[PDB]
Design a protein around this ligand. Structure first.
Ligand code: NA
Length: 121
């Protein structure tokens, strides 16, 4: 139907908006601490600590497969990246500190993304 196509036009626009948002979030991690999943060869016990691992490349695969239905689902994944890091790593580590910074700097981008999604449907 014609309906499903206009929906597919919107999802595709949502995917286009979320891609730009993603690139802006990832620019706030110049050290690329969150770029890739935590290695299970290098941290074998990780899943005993963190039940839902998340990273920017894993978010990207989901994104290009048009797997985010709305901004809220996208935000949940970004928040996992941050919260996982803040549980697994202690407060006096470069990792924890990089997540605090990503959170604070990401807030501005997510603020405007919310307005842009509502504004343009
Ligand atoms: Na902790």
């Amino acid at each position: 139907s014609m309906e499903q196509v206009a929906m597919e036009l919107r999802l595709t626009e949502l995917t286009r908006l979320l891609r730009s948002v993603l690139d802006q979030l990832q620019d706030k991690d110049p050290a690329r601490i969150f770029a890739q999943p935590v290695s299970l060869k290098e941290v074998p016990d990780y899943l005993d600590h963190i039940k839902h691992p998340m990273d920017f490349a894993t978010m990207r695969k989901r994104l290009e497969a048009q797997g985010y239905k709305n901004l809220h689902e996208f935000e949940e994944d970004f928040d996992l990246i941050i919260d996982n890091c803040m549980k697994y790593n202690a407060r006096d580590t470069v990792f924890y500190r990089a997540a605090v910074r990503l959170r604070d700097q990401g807030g501005v981008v997510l603020r405007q993304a919310r307005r842009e999604v509502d504004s343009i449907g």
